[PDB]
Design an enzyme around this catalytic site. Structure first.
Site, mmCIF file in Angstrom:
data_model
loop_
_atom_site.group_PDB
_atom_site.id
_atom_site.type_symbol
_atom_site.label_atom_id
_atom_site.label_comp_id
_atom_site.label_asym_id
_atom_site.label_seq_id
_atom_site.Cartn_x
_atom_site.Cartn_y
_atom_site.Cartn_z
ATOM 1 N N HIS A 64 0.839 -1.215 0.000
ATOM 2 C CA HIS A 64 0.000 0.000 0.000
ATOM 3 C C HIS A 64 0.864 1.251 0.000
ATOM 4 O O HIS A 64 0.604 2.208 -0.733
ATOM 5 C CB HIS A 64 -0.927 0.030 1.219
ATOM 6 C CG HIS A 64 -1.776 -1.188 1.352
ATOM 7 N ND1 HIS A 64 -2.782 -1.490 0.457
ATOM 8 C CD2 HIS A 64 -1.778 -2.180 2.272
ATOM 9 C CE1 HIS A 64 -3.361 -2.621 0.816
ATOM 10 N NE2 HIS A 64 -2.770 -3.061 1.914
ATOM 11 N N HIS A 94 5.099 6.636 7.429
ATOM 12 C CA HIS A 94 4.860 6.312 6.042
ATOM 13 C C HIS A 94 4.317 7.546 5.344
ATOM 14 O O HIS A 94 4.020 8.559 5.986
ATOM 15 C CB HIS A 94 3.850 5.174 5.907
ATOM 16 C CG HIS A 94 2.522 5.539 6.480
ATOM 17 N ND1 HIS A 94 2.232 5.400 7.817
ATOM 18 C CD2 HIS A 94 1.441 6.120 5.911
ATOM 19 C CE1 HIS A 94 1.012 5.854 8.046
ATOM 20 N NE2 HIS A 94 0.518 6.307 6.907
ATOM 21 N N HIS A 96 1.661 9.096 1.971
ATOM 22 C CA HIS A 96 0.669 8.952 0.905
ATOM 23 C C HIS A 96 1.031 9.941 -0.202
ATOM 24 O O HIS A 96 1.388 11.083 0.102
ATOM 25 C CB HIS A 96 -0.740 9.256 1.418
ATOM 26 C CG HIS A 96 -1.124 8.468 2.631
ATOM 27 N ND1 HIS A 96 -1.917 7.341 2.560
ATOM 28 C CD2 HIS A 96 -0.792 8.614 3.937
ATOM 29 C CE1 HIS A 96 -2.081 6.842 3.773
ATOM 30 N NE2 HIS A 96 -1.399 7.589 4.627
ATOM 31 N N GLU A 106 -3.794 13.398 1.942
ATOM 32 C CA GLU A 106 -5.088 12.926 2.446
ATOM 33 C C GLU A 106 -5.888 14.078 3.039
ATOM 34 O O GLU A 106 -6.999 14.370 2.606
ATOM 35 C CB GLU A 106 -4.866 11.823 3.477
ATOM 36 C CG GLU A 106 -4.151 10.632 2.851
ATOM 37 C CD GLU A 106 -4.444 9.334 3.550
ATOM 38 O OE1 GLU A 106 -4.144 9.242 4.752
ATOM 39 O OE2 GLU A 106 -4.947 8.398 2.891
ATOM 40 N N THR A 199 -6.643 3.993 6.457
ATOM 41 C CA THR A 199 -6.819 2.741 5.715
ATOM 42 C C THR A 199 -7.612 1.786 6.586
ATOM 43 O O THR A 199 -7.660 1.950 7.806
ATOM 44 C CB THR A 199 -5.489 2.043 5.348
ATOM 45 O OG1 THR A 199 -4.938 1.434 6.523
ATOM 46 C CG2 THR A 199 -4.498 3.026 4.747
#
Ligand code: 3J4
Ligand code: ZN
Length: 260
Positions: A64, A94, A96, A106, A199
């Site tokens: 992902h 992490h 995105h 996000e 998620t």
């Protein structure tokens, strides 16, 4: 949902609610931050980011995103203060990101999307382990940091250069002695609200702390993010891009600002 959930047309955010009904819950993340509606809260303490003893261990392509993992068996890298009660331990960070510079974050700011968003994930030590913490309304604190494309971020380069070694799902690499302080902007001014994991399982266990000041990364740095793969080795290539959930309804929540 093929394998299971993802970010594609047939298993993406619009599908998640079928296996994770909390997707349509009362405190889902991310959200749009309307800067003119957020209210300054003078009772908010300054954030305390204490990463001097951080022990990074490993970097993993989880199919992902990629996670940089930390030793969280002691209070080595912690977040305190701000809206938080108690001590939250850093377990991983992490990102995105998008397929293009005009999307990827996000959270949004007055509906503006940034090229990427960094999440430093911390859990409340009063719950003993991460698995217990995610079952609590105040179990996690995630520090969110926007990325815009411009000048390079020197403290990000070590991450960028190891990505070739974890191209595909399930690959990991040693990633010791990485200093996450190099990923922070100058200012710690923030917005904060109660929300969720973005998620599946989408658990409503997160105090979100989103920094106002973005960091700048270079076009070359983000280009290397986009060379990662969602797929495993020996499978048809699916570029790891657009692994972001869009803004969710704010519902009965107030976003607070630490700054005037
Ligand atoms: N975006 S967020 O709100 O900051 O939440 C991310 C996504 C979900 N968590 S998680 O449960 O800690 C995380 O999720 C998995 C995959 O999505 C695991 O591969 C992995 O072990 C990991 O530690 C963090
Ligand atoms: Zn995240």
């Amino acid at each position: 949902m093929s394998h299971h959930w993802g970010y594609g047309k047939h298993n993406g955010p619009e599908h998640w609610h079928k296996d994770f009904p909390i997707a349509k819950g009362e405190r889902q993340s991310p959200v749009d931050i309307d800067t003119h509606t957020a209210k300054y809260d003078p009772s908010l303490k300054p954030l305390s980011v204490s990463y001097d003893q951080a022990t990074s261990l490993r970097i993993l392509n989880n199919g992902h995103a990629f996670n940089v993992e930390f030793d969280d068996s002691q209070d080595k890298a912690v977040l305190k203060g701000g809206p938080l009660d108690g001590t939250y331990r850093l377990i991983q960070f992490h990102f995105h990101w998008g397929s293009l510079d005009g999307q990827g974050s996000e959270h949004t700011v007055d509906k503006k999307k940034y090229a990427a968003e960094l999440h430093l994930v911390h859990w409340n030590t009063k719950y003993g382990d991460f698995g217990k913490a995610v079952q609590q309304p105040d179990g996690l604190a995630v520090l969110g940091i926007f990325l815009k494309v411009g000048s390079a971020k020197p403290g990000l380069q070590k991450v960028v250069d190891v990505l070739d070694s974890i191209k595909t799902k399930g690959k990991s690499a040693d990633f010791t002695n990485f200093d996450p302080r190099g990923l922070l902007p100058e200012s710690l001014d923030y917005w904060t609200y109660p929300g969720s994991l973005t998620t599946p399982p989408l658990l409503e266990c997160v105090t979100w702390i989103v920094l106002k000041e973005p960091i700048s990364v270079s076009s070359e740095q983000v280009l290397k993010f986009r060379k990662l793969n969602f797929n495993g080795e020996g499978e048809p290539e699916e570029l790891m891009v657009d692994n972001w959930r869009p803004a969710q309804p704010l519902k009965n929540r107030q976003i607070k600002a630490s700054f005037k």
